[PDB]
Amino acid sequence: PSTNYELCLFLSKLTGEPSLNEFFRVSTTPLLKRVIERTNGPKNTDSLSFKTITQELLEVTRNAPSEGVMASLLNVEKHAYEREYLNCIQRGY
Amino acid sequence: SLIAAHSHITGLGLDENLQPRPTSEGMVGQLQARRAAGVILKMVQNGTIAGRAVLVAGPPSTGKTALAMGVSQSLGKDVPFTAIAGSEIFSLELSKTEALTQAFRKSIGIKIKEETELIEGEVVEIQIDRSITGGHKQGKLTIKTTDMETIYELGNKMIDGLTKEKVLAGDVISIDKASGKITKLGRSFARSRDYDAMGADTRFVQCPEGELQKRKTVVHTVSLHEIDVINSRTQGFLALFTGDTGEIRSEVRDQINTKVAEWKEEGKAEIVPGVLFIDEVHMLDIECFSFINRALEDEFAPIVMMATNRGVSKTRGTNYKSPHGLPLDLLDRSIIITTKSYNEQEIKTILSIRAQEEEVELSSDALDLLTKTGVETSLRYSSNLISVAQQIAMKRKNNTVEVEDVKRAYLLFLDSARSVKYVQENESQYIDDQGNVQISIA
Amino acid sequence: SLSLIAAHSHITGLGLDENLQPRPTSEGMVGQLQARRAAGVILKMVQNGTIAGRAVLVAGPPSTGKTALAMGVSQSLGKDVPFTAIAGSEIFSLELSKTEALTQAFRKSIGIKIKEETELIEGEVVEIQIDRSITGGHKQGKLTIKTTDMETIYELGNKMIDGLTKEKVLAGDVISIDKASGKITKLGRSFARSRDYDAMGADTRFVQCPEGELQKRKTVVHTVSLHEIDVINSRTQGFLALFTGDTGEIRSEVRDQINTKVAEWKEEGKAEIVPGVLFIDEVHMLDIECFSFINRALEDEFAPIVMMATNRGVSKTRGTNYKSPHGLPLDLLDRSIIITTKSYNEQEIKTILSIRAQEEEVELSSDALDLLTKTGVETSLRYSSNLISVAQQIAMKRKNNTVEVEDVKRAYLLFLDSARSVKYVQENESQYIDDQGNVQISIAK
Amino acid sequence: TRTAAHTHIKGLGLDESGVAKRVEGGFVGQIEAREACGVIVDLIKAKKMSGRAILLAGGPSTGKTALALAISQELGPKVPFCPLVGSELYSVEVKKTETLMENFRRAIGLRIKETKEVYEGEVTELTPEDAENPLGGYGKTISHVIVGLKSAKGTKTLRLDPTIYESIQREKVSIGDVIYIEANTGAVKRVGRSDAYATEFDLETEEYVPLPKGEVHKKKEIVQDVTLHDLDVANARPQGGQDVISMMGQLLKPKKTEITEKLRQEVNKVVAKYIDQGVAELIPGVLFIDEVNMLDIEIFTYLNKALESNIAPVVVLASNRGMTTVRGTEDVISPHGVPPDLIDRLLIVRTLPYDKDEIRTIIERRATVERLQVESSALDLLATMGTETSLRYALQLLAPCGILAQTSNRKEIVVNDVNEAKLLFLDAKRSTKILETSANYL
Amino acid sequence: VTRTAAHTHIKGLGLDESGVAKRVEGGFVGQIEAREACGVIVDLIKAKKMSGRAILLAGGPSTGKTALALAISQELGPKVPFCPLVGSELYSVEVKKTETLMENFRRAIGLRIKETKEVYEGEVTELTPEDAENKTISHVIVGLKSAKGTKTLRLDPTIYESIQREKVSIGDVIYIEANTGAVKRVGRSDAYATEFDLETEEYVPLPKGEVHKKKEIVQDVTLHDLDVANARPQGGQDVISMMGQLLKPKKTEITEKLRQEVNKVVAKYIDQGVAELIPGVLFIDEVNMLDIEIFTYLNKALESNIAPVVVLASNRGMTTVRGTEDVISPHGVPPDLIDRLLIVRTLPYDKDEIRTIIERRATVERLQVESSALDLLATMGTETSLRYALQLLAPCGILAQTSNRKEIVVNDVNEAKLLFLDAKRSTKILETSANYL
Ligand SMILES: Nc1ncnc2c1ncn2[C@@H]1O[C@H](COP(=O)(O)OP(=O)(O)O)[C@@H](O)[C@H]1O
Ligand SMILES: Nc1ncnc2c1ncn2[C@@H]1O[C@H](COP(=O)(O)OP(=O)(O)O)[C@@H](O)[C@H]1O
Ligand SMILES: Nc1ncnc2c1ncn2[C@@H]1O[C@H](COP(=O)(O)OP(=O)(O)O)[C@@H](O)[C@H]1O
Ligand SMILES: Nc1ncnc2c1ncn2[C@@H]1O[C@H](COP(=O)(O)OP(=O)(O)O)[C@@H](O)[C@H]1O
């Protein structure tokens, strides 16, 4: 941001990051260290970062009980785990 | 679901003496191929014969995949039927031999018996002790039926299944111990103290009586390929759905083979074989044919049905021509079922069956015109014309399909020969093989 | 400052009038009056911005100025308008398909203009006094921000304190805070508070303390291409793929959702669509699959104007086995309009050579200019244009300022053109490796 | 307003139960093709069939893509429509079969109605009420959480579960924030702060949302339109696994993987289960593939495989070649570049070239859509231009004619303007002629 | 004793101050016209004004095209960047070939940055962190000590974090860079070497010099270095990691947006006077191995404003272009690129300059060759090839040395000719024999 403030402002308008130093911090950290330390809560609403349809379906079933239609239509791997009795299958290899 | 091209075929239409009826279970005609398919089906149902190659050959629009779907419908449930085409083998993340191995092992099923305790009852009290960060979870569940009341110790997964589909006290729930399934059957208490948070409107369920724990034996079928994918890495269950199972090593396959032999010898599991159907088998490379030749000689090899509609044609990956597009060492290991063309009566019966399945009412003369068109051009052309003729007749505000609806659909939609003649009469209007065309009118 | 003198640096745009009539010599463009008038018609259509997806094919013999006409169009187009100049060989990639690379090239050439209002408080931090709440909620803070001129006190909320503790800002640090949106930055450490520490840190940057007014208003206009929005919405942290380039075949549903959201942001007026030009130089080096995808992709409303350049005659289309005009199939030429560039006479060669010599600050004499014009008419324009600079260096080695006839003759003797090199190769064919690989390294037998 | 050689096409323009009007809906001519496409549109709206293939066959610039777009606009925006080029299936991340299958699944839509009962609004108080005789060894044992919500004209005090309170700590909910709670799940959602509660006048990075309208307790029926490919994509990835490799793949490039048939059958059976309950409705759509002559022979054989499934949508193919070699083969001469088995599996709709008056009316309609005024003599010269040269060249020459008209301060397009546009921009035929005459590598 | 490569004997173009090539100077003999043309080329490079200039060195094998390219490289100096490359190197299996060509284009444009290096070296005597909370430390007072005395420093908590990263205690000789902020623990001093009789500590001496040492350095980077510095799919180039990261970073297509941003940053630093821009040379030997797509991208990329001087080499004649089927072109280079080139013709040699090449290679390899043996080697070079004599020079010296002679005799040349064969004699043996030689 000391020499390229315009690019940082453009990227903050694009992504909606509340801090202009996020791009320099992300570009200069290891990827596993970045994966561990991603606890980001707020985002700017006035931005070009959009909430996709599939991401909305992910968000509504983050904490949702069973037998709801949206909950059960996106939780089929757990249903296949439960109905195939894969909780008690022995190790082979 | 929807009406597909093989929805009318509900089996093979054979007696107990493996003799085909003239018209049964949506299959009409092709008696020798149907009898041979019944013999193949009985060989699959015996289960003691492994790794036999079966080739289904004939002209297009004859019933090779119809016969395969009849075998699949007559195969029964909990028996695998892997129906693939020859183009799925060519992949960017898998080798041809590895994709063929996965297709082979998807067709072999393992029937596993498990012992399960079912615990159905009213919840008296749920105590859940969690860590500060919420990682470690333990606790107790005091559950009750009308005879006795017990306290169980809960693990991490059972508490995770209790938090979702939120169980309060007075709820009749069912616990499946071998699968970790939490099923809230309902609420039996209907307490006066009602919270404003929940929107639950659970139905009243009577109090379950009898014993609390019921022992039962459950039976489930898991394919071989599921076991190699699960044992291949840590998150193999995700790879069962994402398909990111990149080139599973042979050590995993050998250990899974020895483990499933040990499961067979213990009486815990049994091995059932299935059918690997390969439509358009001429599309495979010569390397695929060599791998199929050596992989048919395995103990864990299913019955392989292949369908092709080509004569003496060029084998892919080579520079020569072979019968059915397949080399002679593969045809040495295969028994060929031949399928023949139809006459007027069989085409008429197929069209009547397809119109009955599609809820389309045809008159006698409309059916005769459709039979004549199917004989002249193609059976698939008239079977496709049935639906658009039905749409035209419903646009005319009459229930049944008349002759003029079939004639209007024939005039509106072209077949192969009429389109070929129209292209050849108007050659300059179309882009030829040299990329020359006359777009301009004058 | 970084840019050196290139092959098209002398062109500042199309030399046209207000009536779209080209001047004989204006803005570095000489001749090609029909081509320049047609390119001026093309520029107006891009500036109108009301029609989409026209394919324009610039065709002609080599060294006639198809790429020069494209750079003139790009210079006359002005700034903040997306011009994407790519070659035909860049489409063939390893982790991106040809249709996906063409889609990314198409959507990089059309963007949206977005207006932003910034109320920036830029200054050095003097003291941060934190009113520690008993319950911990709504942590009040007192920021003492200070410029060279004057200094106030600002009230700070709890999320403001969390943002100022997420990045490590202390006394003497130069920060600017946005009043409207709450954006946080850290420009570094002020130069007045720079000598207090004997060794600076790894992330310590030294910036000058800002002067003037503490709070400033500014309007920022951002031109964001559609490909930028695709890459941003494709990933969780998608801004790195805007620079590293590993976007990796963005799925379709993101593109339809982004197109619908761009349409509704247009209809509610917070962004405006700016179309631009995608220029494919040497478009004959594309597969027939690329041509078919271009044919279908020109029919979308979010499609730029496509200018294609070709120097091919009736040549074989790539991916097929038949020949076609311009190396392009007939259905692509059906949805296209062709601008034809012609060869130059002696006066146009002399004028372009004089302009290129003036661009490189080379003082050509009249006889040297006539000799270079004769060489340009005889061999090629680009041979004389390349001969100008080496003749300048030859004259500078001779302790001379201007070039003469002898410098141009020495540069002609030292450096060969295509025809002379072809003659020298064909006269001694045993000394060079043949198409069958045969060669005679031995000089005697 | 932007025009892109389309958007004059507004549907097909058939009347009800009758013959297409000659000039209606932005279409001029092609009466039989428009009637066939209307029959196909009615067949799609019948919501009964699966895997029906129509091939639009004709010359260049005859209206095949216009007819496909007319089908898409006649079906409405709720019915899915996937436009596609034959070159798009050659992906380098995943195999071409997987791209074809995911484009098949993209054209099957699902409409789901559901009931959302929510309490949202600006909060007034947060009192975690302590219980009587509150155990021992723990601080602030909560009996229930009282939340006072307010909105426009409504104010409700809610007595929530204690276990929502940690969620109160999770989303950082304080007094003055606008929160949002679903009744069934009991999960809070901090939308933002109220506009009246902008206490930090100087500097704050909070998102100040307006106070929501209507009552706090709102129970509404919403309708969500998804596709089957969206369900497959959302079910393939680990939904909230909260482990290291899940966030690793979240931060990495989303590489396309071969989605297995097992996941597709699981999605199909849960979709059929919720269809049988009446809460979901399946709609089939149109997968349009233009210039299918670019497809490989493996694509054609996988199309033969995939058109027989019970799920597959209506596939509209287009081609402009007449009698050419199939891609991937070396000596198979076929009509329209489509092999005879797939040709047998489809219905052919033929499209005819136009006349002088049809070209003139198309040019005049495009001039009215592009908001250009053309006089009658210039329109006649453009019609003669479109007959001598291509129709598309006369259509694309309208905008340079408008530029040359507006640069001379007039709105009418004059014969001099179209002569100047003829002299400026060249036809493909005239460019080919000057390429043949000039031997200077033109 | 230095090793000798094939181009070791060449030190420059051998020109005078007027540009006229001396006949035998700078390791060259003959080839005066191409040497003068390359001198004009290096004058154009030293002008530092032009961009995208392209010269093709065309001539037969063993005529000195690569010799002239390395002579250009020594004439420019190590300050000017030089990127030697083969046309085969552009075919990468990680990234596309045009991206590799553009990366090699950016590798030949360099920057000189003058910088300071200030180093505090010595044993920690006091390590007192001052907290001054507002938990969090305000600063740390560190007292370093070497044999010339002690010095006290005030350090920010970032350097304190790096110090506690290195497990620095009282009595450890440590290293501190003032500009970068890097902290390296050299190890414990020998003043504390007898606290225990046996411990895992590495005992290093006190520094004999001063604690604080400052000097001036120059950083020679390229534009490709700054391109790959800020284009990482997985970051973390700053942290010192001996073991590899868990996910292997792959070469990616760097977008033009990063190139424009890097160019803007570099131009901003140049306008401040911090950095100096040095255009250089991209040399491509065996340019006939380029695909027609790479030729097309070379045509596009030679018109850039930041492109370096490109020098191409080829030894083919009327040859089909690679990637095409019927394009017969000179030197395997398509005629659209040839129009942008300047062609320098490279001539073959005769007997006398072949003899002087042989004697110069013998003098450089420190071999004494007798005069009649030199004449026999020159006759063999005219008969077989020049490189045959140049490669048989060293077996002649070995056969002379094994006979305890420091002078190469005619019998050594005959023995080396008998033991080692050229291409023509081996081709004759190949043709006469039947069972695969
Ligand atoms: N014996 C039969 N009974 C009923 N339908 C048949 C029979 N034989 C063929 N068909 C129908 O003919 C059509 C073409 O048969 P299919 O096996 O799919 O292709 P092919 O015979 O070319 O492999 C199918 O739609 C199928 O329903
Ligand atoms: N009309 C023109 N005005 C000025 N310079 C021109 C013109 N046409 C061509 N040139 C010069 O000729 C050189 C080669 O032209 P170029 O644009 O490469 O033609 P093409 O793209 O057809 O090969 C360019 O460097 C350019 O400077
Ligand atoms: N009958 C018609 N009425 C009106 N416009 C038409 C008609 N036929 C074609 N067009 C227009 O001509 C243009 C080119 O037709 P297109 O559908 O691209 O041809 P193709 O069938 O070769 O793809 C389209 O923009 C289309 O709107
Ligand atoms: N004019 C010359 N003077 C001295 N040595 C030369 C001369 N020309 C070539 N050589 C030497 O000959 C050897 C081979 O020449 P080289 O440049 O590899 O041929 P090519 O041009 O085919 O690459 C080199 O080691 C070089 O040192």
Side-chain angles (χ1 to χ4, degrees), chain C residues 7-8 10 28-32 61-68 344 352 356 381-382, chain E residues 303 340:
Chain C
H8 297 138
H10 66 284
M29 279 224 93
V30 183
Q32 292 286 337
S63 184
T64 40
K66 313 182 291 285
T67 319
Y344 300 114
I352 292 167
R356 291 288 314 159
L381 208 165
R382 267 191 284 239
Chain E
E303 322 177 353
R340 314 168 156 83

mmCIF file of all heavy atoms in Angstrom, chain C residues 7-8 10 28-32 61-68 344 352 356 381-382, chain E residues 303 340, ligand 2:
data_model
loop_
_atom_site.group_PDB
_atom_site.id
_atom_site.type_symbol
_atom_site.label_atom_id
_atom_site.label_comp_id
_atom_site.label_asym_id
_atom_site.label_seq_id
_atom_site.Cartn_x
_atom_site.Cartn_y
_atom_site.Cartn_z
ATOM 1 N N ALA C 7 8.009 -0.814 -32.232
ATOM 2 C CA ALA C 7 7.688 -0.747 -33.652
ATOM 3 C C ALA C 7 6.452 0.098 -33.937
ATOM 4 O O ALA C 7 6.248 0.502 -35.087
ATOM 5 C CB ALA C 7 7.490 -2.154 -34.212
ATOM 6 N N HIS C 8 5.630 0.371 -32.925
ATOM 7 C CA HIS C 8 4.399 1.131 -33.114
ATOM 8 C C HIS C 8 4.291 2.291 -32.132
ATOM 9 O O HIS C 8 3.183 2.756 -31.851
ATOM 10 C CB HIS C 8 3.179 0.216 -32.982
ATOM 11 C CG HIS C 8 3.115 -0.856 -34.024
ATOM 12 N ND1 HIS C 8 2.754 -2.153 -33.733
ATOM 13 C CD2 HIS C 8 3.364 -0.824 -35.355
ATOM 14 C CE1 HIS C 8 2.785 -2.876 -34.840
ATOM 15 N NE2 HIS C 8 3.151 -2.092 -35.837
ATOM 16 N N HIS C 10 5.288 5.358 -32.535
ATOM 17 C CA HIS C 10 5.067 6.635 -33.200
ATOM 18 C C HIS C 10 3.602 6.906 -33.503
ATOM 19 O O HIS C 10 3.279 8.007 -33.960
ATOM 20 C CB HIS C 10 5.858 6.684 -34.506
ATOM 21 C CG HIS C 10 5.383 5.701 -35.527
ATOM 22 N ND1 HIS C 10 5.661 4.356 -35.445
ATOM 23 C CD2 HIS C 10 4.624 5.862 -36.635
ATOM 24 C CE1 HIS C 10 5.105 3.731 -36.466
ATOM 25 N NE2 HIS C 10 4.475 4.623 -37.207
ATOM 26 N N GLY C 28 0.943 10.011 -36.687
ATOM 27 C CA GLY C 28 1.857 8.927 -36.970
ATOM 28 C C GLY C 28 1.374 7.907 -37.977
ATOM 29 O O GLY C 28 2.044 6.889 -38.165
ATOM 30 N N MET C 29 0.240 8.141 -38.629
ATOM 31 C CA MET C 29 -0.321 7.206 -39.599
ATOM 32 C C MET C 29 -0.258 7.839 -40.982
ATOM 33 O O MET C 29 -0.757 8.950 -41.184
ATOM 34 C CB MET C 29 -1.755 6.836 -39.230
ATOM 35 C CG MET C 29 -1.854 5.761 -38.159
ATOM 36 S SD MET C 29 -3.095 4.506 -38.513
ATOM 37 C CE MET C 29 -2.107 3.274 -39.353
ATOM 38 N N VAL C 30 0.356 7.132 -41.929
ATOM 39 C CA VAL C 30 0.574 7.626 -43.284
ATOM 40 C C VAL C 30 -0.147 6.707 -44.257
ATOM 41 O O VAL C 30 0.026 5.483 -44.208
ATOM 42 C CB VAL C 30 2.074 7.696 -43.628
ATOM 43 C CG1 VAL C 30 2.275 8.285 -45.011
ATOM 44 C CG2 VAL C 30 2.821 8.502 -42.593
ATOM 45 N N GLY C 31 -0.951 7.298 -45.144
ATOM 46 C CA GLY C 31 -1.632 6.532 -46.165
ATOM 47 C C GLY C 31 -2.743 5.677 -45.580
ATOM 48 O O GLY C 31 -3.234 5.918 -44.472
ATOM 49 N N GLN C 32 -3.113 4.648 -46.359
ATOM 50 C CA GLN C 32 -4.166 3.682 -46.023
ATOM 51 C C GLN C 32 -5.490 4.378 -45.715
ATOM 52 O O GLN C 32 -6.104 4.148 -44.674
ATOM 53 C CB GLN C 32 -3.743 2.772 -44.866
ATOM 54 C CG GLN C 32 -2.615 1.821 -45.200
ATOM 55 C CD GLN C 32 -3.066 0.678 -46.078
ATOM 56 O OE1 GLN C 32 -4.244 0.335 -46.110
ATOM 57 N NE2 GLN C 32 -2.125 0.079 -46.798
ATOM 58 N N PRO C 61 -1.394 -7.925 -47.429
ATOM 59 C CA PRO C 61 -0.030 -8.471 -47.438
ATOM 60 C C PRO C 61 0.738 -8.016 -46.209
ATOM 61 O O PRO C 61 0.351 -7.030 -45.564
ATOM 62 C CB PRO C 61 0.575 -7.898 -48.729
ATOM 63 C CG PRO C 61 -0.264 -6.748 -49.094
ATOM 64 C CD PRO C 61 -1.613 -6.928 -48.489
ATOM 65 N N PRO C 62 1.803 -8.729 -45.828
ATOM 66 C CA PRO C 62 2.569 -8.331 -44.638
ATOM 67 C C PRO C 62 3.288 -7.004 -44.819
ATOM 68 O O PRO C 62 3.562 -6.567 -45.940
ATOM 69 C CB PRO C 62 3.569 -9.479 -44.458
ATOM 70 C CG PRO C 62 3.596 -10.187 -45.764
ATOM 71 C CD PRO C 62 2.220 -10.054 -46.314
ATOM 72 N N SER C 63 3.573 -6.367 -43.673
ATOM 73 C CA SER C 63 4.189 -5.037 -43.577
ATOM 74 C C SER C 63 3.375 -3.976 -44.316
ATOM 75 O O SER C 63 3.924 -3.117 -45.008
ATOM 76 C CB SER C 63 5.644 -5.048 -44.061
ATOM 77 O OG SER C 63 6.244 -3.779 -43.881
ATOM 78 N N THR C 64 2.052 -4.035 -44.161
ATOM 79 C CA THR C 64 1.168 -3.013 -44.704
ATOM 80 C C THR C 64 0.438 -2.216 -43.637
ATOM 81 O O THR C 64 -0.166 -1.190 -43.966
ATOM 82 C CB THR C 64 0.130 -3.635 -45.648
ATOM 83 O OG1 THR C 64 -0.327 -4.880 -45.107
ATOM 84 C CG2 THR C 64 0.743 -3.873 -47.009
ATOM 85 N N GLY C 65 0.466 -2.651 -42.382
ATOM 86 C CA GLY C 65 -0.069 -1.847 -41.306
ATOM 87 C C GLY C 65 -1.397 -2.306 -40.750
ATOM 88 O O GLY C 65 -2.222 -1.474 -40.366
ATOM 89 N N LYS C 66 -1.629 -3.618 -40.708
ATOM 90 C CA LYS C 66 -2.814 -4.132 -40.030
ATOM 91 C C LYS C 66 -2.686 -3.968 -38.520
ATOM 92 O O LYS C 66 -3.602 -3.462 -37.855
ATOM 93 C CB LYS C 66 -3.029 -5.601 -40.396
ATOM 94 C CG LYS C 66 -2.910 -5.889 -41.878
ATOM 95 C CD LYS C 66 -3.178 -7.350 -42.172
ATOM 96 C CE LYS C 66 -2.066 -8.230 -41.636
ATOM 97 N NZ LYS C 66 -0.846 -8.145 -42.479
ATOM 98 N N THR C 67 -1.542 -4.376 -37.967
ATOM 99 C CA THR C 67 -1.280 -4.171 -36.549
ATOM 100 C C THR C 67 -1.098 -2.693 -36.232
ATOM 101 O O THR C 67 -1.470 -2.246 -35.142
ATOM 102 C CB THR C 67 -0.046 -4.965 -36.123
ATOM 103 O OG1 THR C 67 -0.065 -6.252 -36.755
ATOM 104 C CG2 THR C 67 -0.030 -5.165 -34.617
ATOM 105 N N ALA C 68 -0.549 -1.924 -37.176
ATOM 106 C CA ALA C 68 -0.460 -0.477 -37.015
ATOM 107 C C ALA C 68 -1.843 0.160 -36.950
ATOM 108 O O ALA C 68 -2.078 1.071 -36.147
ATOM 109 C CB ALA C 68 0.355 0.124 -38.158
ATOM 110 N N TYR C 344 2.285 0.087 -50.300
ATOM 111 C CA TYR C 344 2.672 1.489 -50.315
ATOM 112 C C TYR C 344 3.507 1.812 -51.548
ATOM 113 O O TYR C 344 4.252 0.968 -52.055
ATOM 114 C CB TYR C 344 3.462 1.845 -49.054
ATOM 115 C CG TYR C 344 2.702 1.634 -47.767
ATOM 116 C CD1 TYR C 344 3.106 0.672 -46.849
ATOM 117 C CD2 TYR C 344 1.581 2.397 -47.465
ATOM 118 C CE1 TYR C 344 2.414 0.475 -45.670
ATOM 119 C CE2 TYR C 344 0.885 2.210 -46.287
ATOM 120 C CZ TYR C 344 1.306 1.248 -45.395
ATOM 121 O OH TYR C 344 0.614 1.057 -44.224
ATOM 122 N N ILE C 352 6.838 7.199 -44.025
ATOM 123 C CA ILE C 352 6.879 6.310 -42.864
ATOM 124 C C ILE C 352 8.311 6.167 -42.350
ATOM 125 O O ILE C 352 8.544 6.166 -41.134
ATOM 126 C CB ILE C 352 6.249 4.947 -43.212
ATOM 127 C CG1 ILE C 352 4.746 5.098 -43.441
ATOM 128 C CG2 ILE C 352 6.438 3.937 -42.099
ATOM 129 C CD1 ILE C 352 4.110 3.895 -44.092
ATOM 130 N N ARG C 356 9.590 7.250 -38.652
ATOM 131 C CA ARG C 356 10.304 6.315 -37.784
ATOM 132 C C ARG C 356 11.700 6.817 -37.427
ATOM 133 O O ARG C 356 12.186 6.544 -36.324
ATOM 134 C CB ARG C 356 10.398 4.940 -38.442
ATOM 135 C CG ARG C 356 9.077 4.201 -38.544
ATOM 136 C CD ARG C 356 8.599 3.707 -37.192
ATOM 137 N NE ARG C 356 9.660 3.066 -36.425
ATOM 138 C CZ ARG C 356 9.639 2.902 -35.111
ATOM 139 N NH1 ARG C 356 8.623 3.329 -34.378
ATOM 140 N NH2 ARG C 356 10.662 2.297 -34.516
ATOM 141 N N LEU C 381 9.549 -2.554 -46.177
ATOM 142 C CA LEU C 381 9.522 -1.434 -45.238
ATOM 143 C C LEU C 381 10.299 -1.753 -43.964
ATOM 144 O O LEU C 381 11.070 -0.918 -43.470
ATOM 145 C CB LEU C 381 8.069 -1.091 -44.893
ATOM 146 C CG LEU C 381 7.602 0.314 -44.487
ATOM 147 C CD1 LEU C 381 6.088 0.373 -44.572
ATOM 148 C CD2 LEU C 381 8.047 0.721 -43.094
ATOM 149 N N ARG C 382 10.095 -2.954 -43.415
ATOM 150 C CA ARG C 382 10.663 -3.289 -42.116
ATOM 151 C C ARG C 382 12.173 -3.460 -42.186
ATOM 152 O O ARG C 382 12.864 -3.211 -41.194
ATOM 153 C CB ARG C 382 10.003 -4.552 -41.567
ATOM 154 C CG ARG C 382 8.818 -4.269 -40.663
ATOM 155 C CD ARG C 382 8.365 -5.515 -39.930
ATOM 156 N NE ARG C 382 7.615 -6.414 -40.796
ATOM 157 C CZ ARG C 382 6.366 -6.798 -40.576
ATOM 158 N NH1 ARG C 382 5.691 -6.374 -39.520
ATOM 159 N NH2 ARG C 382 5.780 -7.627 -41.432
ATOM 160 N N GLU E 303 7.046 -6.725 -30.827
ATOM 161 C CA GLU E 303 6.524 -5.369 -30.910
ATOM 162 C C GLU E 303 6.220 -4.768 -29.545
ATOM 163 O O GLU E 303 5.613 -3.697 -29.474
ATOM 164 C CB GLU E 303 5.268 -5.344 -31.781
ATOM 165 C CG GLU E 303 5.338 -6.262 -32.987
ATOM 166 C CD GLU E 303 4.050 -6.268 -33.781
ATOM 167 O OE1 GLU E 303 3.065 -5.657 -33.321
ATOM 168 O OE2 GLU E 303 4.022 -6.885 -34.867
ATOM 169 N N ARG E 340 11.170 -9.065 -39.980
ATOM 170 C CA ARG E 340 11.550 -8.305 -38.798
ATOM 171 C C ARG E 340 12.990 -8.543 -38.363
ATOM 172 O O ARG E 340 13.463 -7.864 -37.447
ATOM 173 C CB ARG E 340 10.610 -8.631 -37.633
ATOM 174 C CG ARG E 340 9.141 -8.635 -37.998
ATOM 175 C CD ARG E 340 8.309 -9.237 -36.882
ATOM 176 N NE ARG E 340 6.925 -8.774 -36.901
ATOM 177 C CZ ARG E 340 5.970 -9.293 -37.659
ATOM 178 N NH1 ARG E 340 6.208 -10.307 -38.476
ATOM 179 N NH2 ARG E 340 4.741 -8.789 -37.592
HETATM 180 N N1 LIG F 2 -0.026 3.614 -42.155
HETATM 181 C C1 LIG F 2 1.149 3.523 -41.490
HETATM 182 N N2 LIG F 2 1.683 4.592 -40.861
HETATM 183 C C2 LIG F 2 2.848 4.513 -40.198
HETATM 184 N N3 LIG F 2 3.577 3.390 -40.101
HETATM 185 C C3 LIG F 2 3.162 2.241 -40.683
HETATM 186 C C4 LIG F 2 1.896 2.247 -41.426
HETATM 187 N N4 LIG F 2 1.721 1.002 -41.896
HETATM 188 C C5 LIG F 2 2.782 0.264 -41.490
HETATM 189 N N5 LIG F 2 3.639 1.000 -40.764
HETATM 190 C C6 LIG F 2 4.907 0.505 -40.174
HETATM 191 O O1 LIG F 2 5.273 -0.728 -40.795
HETATM 192 C C7 LIG F 2 5.714 -1.670 -39.820
HETATM 193 C C8 LIG F 2 5.120 -3.034 -40.110
HETATM 194 O O2 LIG F 2 3.708 -2.887 -40.221
HETATM 195 P P1 LIG F 2 2.736 -3.935 -39.495
HETATM 196 O O3 LIG F 2 1.745 -3.168 -38.656
HETATM 197 O O4 LIG F 2 3.591 -5.015 -38.883
HETATM 198 O O5 LIG F 2 1.967 -4.567 -40.756
HETATM 199 P P2 LIG F 2 1.378 -6.059 -40.701
HETATM 200 O O6 LIG F 2 0.698 -6.131 -39.356
HETATM 201 O O7 LIG F 2 0.449 -6.092 -41.885
HETATM 202 O O8 LIG F 2 2.585 -6.952 -40.839
HETATM 203 C C9 LIG F 2 5.228 -1.184 -38.472
HETATM 204 O O9 LIG F 2 6.317 -1.161 -37.547
HETATM 205 C C10 LIG F 2 4.731 0.223 -38.695
HETATM 206 O O10 LIG F 2 5.574 1.095 -37.952
#
